[PDB]
PDB file of C-alpha atoms and ligand atoms in Angstrom:
ATOM      1  CA  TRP Y   1     -10.590  93.164  28.562  1.00  0.00           C
ATOM      2  CA  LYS Y   2     -13.618  91.583  26.609  1.00  0.00           C
ATOM      3  CA  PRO Y   3     -16.046  89.219  28.862  1.00  0.00           C
ATOM      4  CA  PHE Y   4     -13.310  86.648  29.206  1.00  0.00           C
ATOM      5  CA  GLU Y   5     -13.914  86.407  32.952  1.00  0.00           C
ATOM      6  CA  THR Y   6     -17.450  85.552  32.826  1.00  0.00           C
ATOM      7  CA  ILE Y   7     -17.076  82.095  30.305  1.00  0.00           C
ATOM      8  CA  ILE Y   8     -14.017  81.485  33.281  1.00  0.00           C
ATOM      9  CA  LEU Y   9     -16.182  81.373  35.629  1.00  0.00           C
ATOM     10  CA  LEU Y  10     -18.554  78.785  33.994  1.00  0.00           C
ATOM     11  CA  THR Y  11     -16.158  76.434  33.079  1.00  0.00           C
ATOM     12  CA  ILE Y  12     -14.920  76.776  36.926  1.00  0.00           C
ATOM     13  CA  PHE Y  13     -19.191  76.156  37.994  1.00  0.00           C
ATOM     14  CA  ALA Y  14     -18.225  73.103  35.116  1.00  0.00           C
ATOM     15  CA  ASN Y  15     -15.148  71.978  37.103  1.00  0.00           C
ATOM     16  CA  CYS Y  16     -16.726  72.158  40.089  1.00  0.00           C
ATOM     17  CA  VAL Y  17     -19.820  70.070  39.192  1.00  0.00           C
ATOM     18  CA  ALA Y  18     -17.684  67.644  37.381  1.00  0.00           C
ATOM     19  CA  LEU Y  19     -15.995  67.432  41.032  1.00  0.00           C
ATOM     20  CA  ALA Y  20     -19.137  66.760  43.179  1.00  0.00           C
ATOM     21  CA  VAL Y  21     -20.557  63.874  40.939  1.00  0.00           C
ATOM     22  CA  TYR Y  22     -17.483  62.417  41.082  1.00  0.00           C
ATOM     23  CA  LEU Y  23     -17.770  58.714  42.651  1.00  0.00           C
ATOM     24  CA  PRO Y  24     -15.279  57.199  45.390  1.00  0.00           C
ATOM     25  CA  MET Y  25     -14.769  53.844  44.771  1.00  0.00           C
ATOM     26  CA  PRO Y  26     -13.586  51.138  47.239  1.00  0.00           C
ATOM     27  CA  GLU Y  27     -10.126  49.228  46.854  1.00  0.00           C
ATOM     28  CA  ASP Y  28      -9.165  50.712  43.141  1.00  0.00           C
ATOM     29  CA  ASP Y  29     -12.825  50.273  42.045  1.00  0.00           C
ATOM     30  CA  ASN Y  30     -14.439  52.629  39.018  1.00  0.00           C
ATOM     31  CA  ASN Y  31     -17.610  53.424  37.139  1.00  0.00           C
ATOM     32  CA  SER Y  32     -18.141  53.926  33.793  1.00  0.00           C
ATOM     33  CA  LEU Y  33     -18.737  57.879  34.593  1.00  0.00           C
ATOM     34  CA  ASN Y  34     -15.844  58.398  36.531  1.00  0.00           C
ATOM     35  CA  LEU Y  35     -13.562  56.966  33.890  1.00  0.00           C
ATOM     36  CA  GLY Y  36     -15.657  59.911  32.052  1.00  0.00           C
ATOM     37  CA  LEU Y  37     -14.533  62.781  34.471  1.00  0.00           C
ATOM     38  CA  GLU Y  38     -10.648  61.835  34.315  1.00  0.00           C
ATOM     39  CA  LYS Y  39     -10.596  63.000  30.783  1.00  0.00           C
ATOM     40  CA  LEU Y  40     -13.080  66.012  31.129  1.00  0.00           C
ATOM     41  CA  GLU Y  41     -10.352  67.246  33.425  1.00  0.00           C
ATOM     42  CA  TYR Y  42      -7.921  67.548  30.868  1.00  0.00           C
ATOM     43  CA  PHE Y  43     -10.095  69.854  29.681  1.00  0.00           C
ATOM     44  CA  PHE Y  44     -10.357  72.043  31.814  1.00  0.00           C
ATOM     45  CA  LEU Y  45      -6.393  71.881  32.653  1.00  0.00           C
ATOM     46  CA  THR Y  46      -5.499  73.388  29.113  1.00  0.00           C
ATOM     47  CA  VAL Y  47      -8.090  75.830  29.436  1.00  0.00           C
ATOM     48  CA  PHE Y  48      -6.259  77.342  32.755  1.00  0.00           C
TER      49      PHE Y  48
ATOM     50  CA  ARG I   1     -32.761  23.107  54.307  1.00  0.00           C
ATOM     51  CA  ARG I   2     -33.257  18.970  55.173  1.00  0.00           C
ATOM     52  CA  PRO I   3     -31.227  16.401  52.011  1.00  0.00           C
ATOM     53  CA  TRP I   4     -34.547  14.246  51.770  1.00  0.00           C
ATOM     54  CA  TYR I   5     -36.494  17.935  51.035  1.00  0.00           C
ATOM     55  CA  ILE I   6     -34.059  19.258  48.772  1.00  0.00           C
ATOM     56  CA  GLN I   7     -33.178  16.122  47.125  1.00  0.00           C
ATOM     57  CA  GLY I   8     -36.977  15.857  46.771  1.00  0.00           C
ATOM     58  CA  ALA I   9     -37.294  18.790  45.704  1.00  0.00           C
ATOM     59  CA  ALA I  10     -34.782  19.164  42.171  1.00  0.00           C
ATOM     60  CA  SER I  11     -33.147  17.664  40.210  1.00  0.00           C
ATOM     61  CA  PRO I  12     -29.168  17.388  40.067  1.00  0.00           C
ATOM     62  CA  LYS I  13     -28.142  20.498  39.437  1.00  0.00           C
ATOM     63  CA  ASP I  14     -24.175  21.698  37.800  1.00  0.00           C
ATOM     64  CA  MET I  15     -23.718  24.934  39.435  1.00  0.00           C
ATOM     65  CA  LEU I  16     -21.409  27.254  38.809  1.00  0.00           C
ATOM     66  CA  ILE I  17     -21.357  30.157  42.189  1.00  0.00           C
ATOM     67  CA  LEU I  18     -19.529  32.890  40.460  1.00  0.00           C
ATOM     68  CA  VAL I  19     -18.371  35.901  43.113  1.00  0.00           C
ATOM     69  CA  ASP I  20     -17.697  39.597  42.731  1.00  0.00           C
ATOM     70  CA  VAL I  21     -14.339  40.096  44.697  1.00  0.00           C
ATOM     71  CA  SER I  22     -14.113  43.383  42.580  1.00  0.00           C
ATOM     72  CA  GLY I  23     -13.032  46.967  44.652  1.00  0.00           C
ATOM     73  CA  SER I  24     -17.044  48.106  45.546  1.00  0.00           C
ATOM     74  CA  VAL I  25     -17.523  44.696  47.635  1.00  0.00           C
ATOM     75  CA  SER I  26     -15.192  45.315  50.205  1.00  0.00           C
ATOM     76  CA  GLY I  27     -16.298  45.472  53.833  1.00  0.00           C
ATOM     77  CA  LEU I  28     -19.526  43.961  55.111  1.00  0.00           C
ATOM     78  CA  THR I  29     -20.674  42.662  51.829  1.00  0.00           C
ATOM     79  CA  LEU I  30     -17.978  40.697  51.642  1.00  0.00           C
ATOM     80  CA  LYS I  31     -18.051  38.702  54.738  1.00  0.00           C
ATOM     81  CA  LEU I  32     -21.634  38.641  53.733  1.00  0.00           C
ATOM     82  CA  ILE I  33     -21.331  37.129  50.444  1.00  0.00           C
ATOM     83  CA  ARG I  34     -19.054  34.812  51.817  1.00  0.00           C
ATOM     84  CA  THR I  35     -20.980  33.307  53.723  1.00  0.00           C
ATOM     85  CA  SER I  36     -24.128  33.024  51.688  1.00  0.00           C
ATOM     86  CA  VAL I  37     -21.472  31.377  49.401  1.00  0.00           C
ATOM     87  CA  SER I  38     -21.159  28.936  52.444  1.00  0.00           C
ATOM     88  CA  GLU I  39     -24.731  27.985  53.058  1.00  0.00           C
ATOM     89  CA  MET I  40     -25.588  28.169  49.041  1.00  0.00           C
ATOM     90  CA  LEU I  41     -22.651  25.283  49.743  1.00  0.00           C
ATOM     91  CA  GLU I  42     -24.447  23.591  52.299  1.00  0.00           C
ATOM     92  CA  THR I  43     -27.655  22.662  49.661  1.00  0.00           C
ATOM     93  CA  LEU I  44     -25.722  20.393  47.547  1.00  0.00           C
ATOM     94  CA  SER I  45     -25.218  16.550  47.709  1.00  0.00           C
ATOM     95  CA  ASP I  46     -23.400  13.800  45.981  1.00  0.00           C
ATOM     96  CA  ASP I  47     -25.490  14.200  42.985  1.00  0.00           C
ATOM     97  CA  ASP I  48     -24.760  17.830  42.158  1.00  0.00           C
ATOM     98  CA  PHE I  49     -21.439  19.178  40.460  1.00  0.00           C
ATOM     99  CA  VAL I  50     -20.240  22.970  41.715  1.00  0.00           C
ATOM    100  CA  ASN I  51     -17.341  25.140  41.140  1.00  0.00           C
ATOM    101  CA  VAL I  52     -16.437  28.826  42.137  1.00  0.00           C
ATOM    102  CA  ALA I  53     -15.093  31.496  40.424  1.00  0.00           C
ATOM    103  CA  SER I  54     -14.337  34.963  41.069  1.00  0.00           C
ATOM    104  CA  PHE I  55     -13.716  37.951  38.780  1.00  0.00           C
ATOM    105  CA  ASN I  56     -12.729  41.335  38.913  1.00  0.00           C
ATOM    106  CA  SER I  57     -11.477  42.340  35.332  1.00  0.00           C
ATOM    107  CA  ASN I  58      -9.960  39.034  35.243  1.00  0.00           C
ATOM    108  CA  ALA I  59     -11.974  35.499  35.992  1.00  0.00           C
ATOM    109  CA  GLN I  60      -9.616  32.433  38.092  1.00  0.00           C
ATOM    110  CA  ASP I  61     -10.901  29.646  40.345  1.00  0.00           C
ATOM    111  CA  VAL I  62     -10.783  30.066  43.679  1.00  0.00           C
ATOM    112  CA  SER I  63      -9.369  27.045  44.662  1.00  0.00           C
ATOM    113  CA  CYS I  64      -7.110  24.061  42.608  1.00  0.00           C
ATOM    114  CA  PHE I  65     -10.064  22.270  41.121  1.00  0.00           C
ATOM    115  CA  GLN I  66     -10.586  24.530  37.490  1.00  0.00           C
ATOM    116  CA  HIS I  67     -14.030  22.427  36.611  1.00  0.00           C
ATOM    117  CA  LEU I  68     -16.846  20.903  38.245  1.00  0.00           C
ATOM    118  CA  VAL I  69     -16.437  18.234  41.222  1.00  0.00           C
ATOM    119  CA  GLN I  70     -18.884  16.156  42.662  1.00  0.00           C
ATOM    120  CA  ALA I  71     -19.308  18.234  45.988  1.00  0.00           C
ATOM    121  CA  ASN I  72     -19.266  15.686  48.068  1.00  0.00           C
ATOM    122  CA  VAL I  73     -17.970  17.050  51.773  1.00  0.00           C
ATOM    123  CA  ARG I  74     -14.105  17.204  50.941  1.00  0.00           C
ATOM    124  CA  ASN I  75     -15.005  19.200  47.522  1.00  0.00           C
ATOM    125  CA  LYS I  76     -17.342  21.686  49.250  1.00  0.00           C
ATOM    126  CA  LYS I  77     -14.673  21.623  52.678  1.00  0.00           C
ATOM    127  CA  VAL I  78     -12.202  22.824  50.106  1.00  0.00           C
ATOM    128  CA  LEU I  79     -14.440  24.994  48.313  1.00  0.00           C
ATOM    129  CA  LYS I  80     -15.790  27.081  51.627  1.00  0.00           C
ATOM    130  CA  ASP I  81     -11.999  27.546  52.896  1.00  0.00           C
ATOM    131  CA  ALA I  82     -11.162  28.527  49.521  1.00  0.00           C
ATOM    132  CA  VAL I  83     -13.930  31.108  49.335  1.00  0.00           C
ATOM    133  CA  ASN I  84     -12.962  32.513  53.210  1.00  0.00           C
ATOM    134  CA  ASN I  85      -9.984  33.273  52.217  1.00  0.00           C
ATOM    135  CA  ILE I  86     -10.346  36.238  49.101  1.00  0.00           C
ATOM    136  CA  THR I  87     -10.192  39.549  49.035  1.00  0.00           C
ATOM    137  CA  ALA I  88     -11.580  42.940  46.958  1.00  0.00           C
ATOM    138  CA  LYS I  89      -9.588  44.336  44.743  1.00  0.00           C
ATOM    139  CA  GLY I  90      -9.624  45.668  41.419  1.00  0.00           C
ATOM    140  CA  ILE I  91     -12.438  46.816  38.947  1.00  0.00           C
ATOM    141  CA  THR I  92     -15.100  44.625  38.250  1.00  0.00           C
ATOM    142  CA  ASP I  93     -16.049  42.825  34.802  1.00  0.00           C
ATOM    143  CA  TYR I  94     -19.452  40.942  34.203  1.00  0.00           C
ATOM    144  CA  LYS I  95     -18.105  40.285  30.627  1.00  0.00           C
ATOM    145  CA  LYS I  96     -15.479  37.882  31.898  1.00  0.00           C
TER     146      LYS I  96
HETATM  147  C1  NAG L 101      -5.287  30.870  51.891  1.00  0.00           C
HETATM  148  O1  NAG L 101      -5.409  31.025  53.337  1.00  0.00           O
HETATM  149  C2  NAG L 101      -3.823  30.907  53.942  1.00  0.00           C
HETATM  150  C3  NAG L 101      -3.403  31.229  55.294  1.00  0.00           C
HETATM  151  O2  NAG L 101      -3.542  29.801  55.642  1.00  0.00           O
HETATM  152  C4  NAG L 101      -2.558  32.275  53.349  1.00  0.00           C
HETATM  153  O3  NAG L 101      -0.898  31.664  53.813  1.00  0.00           O
HETATM  154  C5  NAG L 101      -3.145  32.568  51.716  1.00  0.00           C
HETATM  155  O4  NAG L 101      -1.726  33.379  51.798  1.00  0.00           O
HETATM  156  C6  NAG L 101      -4.457  31.854  51.517  1.00  0.00           C
HETATM  157  N1  NAG L 101      -4.898  32.195  49.938  1.00  0.00           N
HETATM  158  C7  NAG L 101      -5.008  33.556  49.288  1.00  0.00           C
HETATM  159  C8  NAG L 101      -5.035  33.534  47.774  1.00  0.00           C
HETATM  160  O5  NAG L 101      -4.424  34.986  50.095  1.00  0.00           O
HETATM  161 CA1   CA L 102     -17.981  46.970  41.808  1.00  0.00          CA
END
């Protein structure tokens, strides 16, 4: 009953932002930001 | 691009052509790189020494040379044939 829904909404908004900033690279390539987002998605997964 | 102009415009060279074959260079830029490397090899004479390397998270040689070669017609032909045979795959690593 606490405003637990607002923080979850902000978390999903942050997850959507992280999905938007991901850069798809051809032929199994990557950059630093993409590698940094593969670790941040663990933070969302454990919260969910 | 004439041999006399090129020999009179600079001193001999020890050239190394480093080619990026990571995943991102897949597509138009790969064929453009192949044509550009062939054209750049066309600017070298018998007094220059060249070798073509290639890196994608790991650095290697494109042909069976493993060191600088005299860059005559035969060696340049071998290097061109090896360059026209590369593919794009992997992650870029400029340090290696
Ligand atoms: C080079 O081209 C030949 C075709 O004559 C092919 O068989 C060979 O696999 C190519 N080399 C590489 C490393 O792909
Ligand atoms: Ca790249």
